[PDB]
């Protein structure tokens, strides 16, 4: 279940590995539009936080969840800032969200007295005055319940079929990164002159077994000249002395 667009949902994603290879390479998505970032470089990014916006809209409304957009959805249901950083992802959900009699459990705001600000949600049921006479909270002549249900049906043309749309919004520099993509490792090769990188510790040398005993906390050591003496491997905690290449 996705929220309706007016009843927008927001999941907070923190303290995790942001593996996006599952999303940017997905063939199930018709839209994968990244703003300020490249889809295939998402795994190289770090965020303070990622927020996931999860909701259902019509196919011709997919373009509205974007920076620079206006319209009933872009202005009354949900706005993205013009300088938005993140990716807008969408796919057809006609076989999930449409219902034969119309999936009218999903609604969008048709009436509002003003436009939304970026990341603002509006779930008010206040009766909108379209005309000149007061409504006093009651539906009637030129007085409306602000939400409009969607006639999502399996027989709708594509522009009227439901789409599941997810926006991954990127939060930076408010706090340290807690969300980072995955880091790809290689095989560990011993008794060769190599260019190495153990997590963040780099250099050139020959890796051989060490007779050192590190305290559980200590991952690598230092010689009297403060050069790297040995490095304990990140996957298996073996300590390897680093011999300079002759």
């Amino acid at each position: 279940r996705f929220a309706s667009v007016y009843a927008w949902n927001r999941k907070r994603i923190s303290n995790c590995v942001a593996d996006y290879s599952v999303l940017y390479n997905s063939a199930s998505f018709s839209t994968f539009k990244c703003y300020g970032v490249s889809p295939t470089k998402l795994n190289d990014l770090c965020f303070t936080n990622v927020y996931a916006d999860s909701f259902v809209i019509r196919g011709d409304e997919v373009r509205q969840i974007a920076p620079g957009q206006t319209g009933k959805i872009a202005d009354y249901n949900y706005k993205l800032p013009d300088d938005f950083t993140g990716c807008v992802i969408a796919w057809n959900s006609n076989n999930l969200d449409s219902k034969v009699g119309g999936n009218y459990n999903y609604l969008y705001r048709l009436f509002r007295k003003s436009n939304l600000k970026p990341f603002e949600r509006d779930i008010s049921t206040e009766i909108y005055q379209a005309g000149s006479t007061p409504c006093n909270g009651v539906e009637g002549f030129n007085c409306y319940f602000p939400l409009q249900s969607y006639g999502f049906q399996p027989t709708n043309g594509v522009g009227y079929q439901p789409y599941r749309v997810v926006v991954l919004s990127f939060e930076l520099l408010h706090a340290p990164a807690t969300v980072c993509g995955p880091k790809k490792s290689t095989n560990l090769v011993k008794n060769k002159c190599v260019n190495f990188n153990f997590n963040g510790l780099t250099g050139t040398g020959v890796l051989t077994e060490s007779n050192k005993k590190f305290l559980p906390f200590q991952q690598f050591g230092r010689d009297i000249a403060d050069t790297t003496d040995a490095v304990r491997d990140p996957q298996t905690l073996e300590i390897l002395d680093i011999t300079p290449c002759s």
Partner: antibody, heavy 122, light 101 residues
Framework: VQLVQSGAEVKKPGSSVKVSCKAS????????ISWVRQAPGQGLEWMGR????????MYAQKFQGRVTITADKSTSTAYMELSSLRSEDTAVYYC??????????????????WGQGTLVTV | EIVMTQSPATLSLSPGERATLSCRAS??????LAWYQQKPGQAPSLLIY???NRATGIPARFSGSGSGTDFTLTISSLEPEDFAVYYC?????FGGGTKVE
Amino acid sequence: VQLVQSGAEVKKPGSSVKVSCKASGGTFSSYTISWVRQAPGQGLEWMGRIIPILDRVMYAQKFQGRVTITADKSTSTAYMELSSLRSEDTAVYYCARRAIDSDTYVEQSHFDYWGQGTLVTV
Amino acid sequence: EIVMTQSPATLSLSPGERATLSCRASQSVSSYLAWYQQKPGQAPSLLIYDASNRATGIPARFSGSGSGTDFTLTISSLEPEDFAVYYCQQPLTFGGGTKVE
């Protein structure tokens, strides 16, 4: 912007009547259809109305619980059914239209066209 | 609902004379008042909309004014064909109607 109503019918008290009006195609995208009744020898009374662009219906209080108003978008036809009829319900049932703004939903209070009216005898 | 009263119930004029009709509502509708002219055998014909605006196809002899709860119809000079029953309509209700004879 024409409207053609069905002809007269005679009903037994306690039975229902379903009155229908056919609008020119395209009416439902820019107009709402309201129902007005006129008992013989009487003035006009408003019964209710449908807005095809909102799927909303408003009713006169005296007919709440007695009258159902709907429309068939594929046939440009407005419908009204009175569930249980009494002799005081004899009237000409008219359809008439009010334009509506599809962006703001501001509806007109006046009718720029009336059908000929359908007489239902009870 | 909005209770509407029209006054007088009947008028008696010669063709060529000026006539006005008064309408009062128990509730304000701002300017949302429609005036109709009904003749026997016909559905009511719109004369004026939004209290004072003349309807398309209606001759210049028809005019009007009003707001809120109090409205007036003016026929500057009645023609032999204007001895009709006039009605005041608001979005929810109608008045009883006034006959000009």
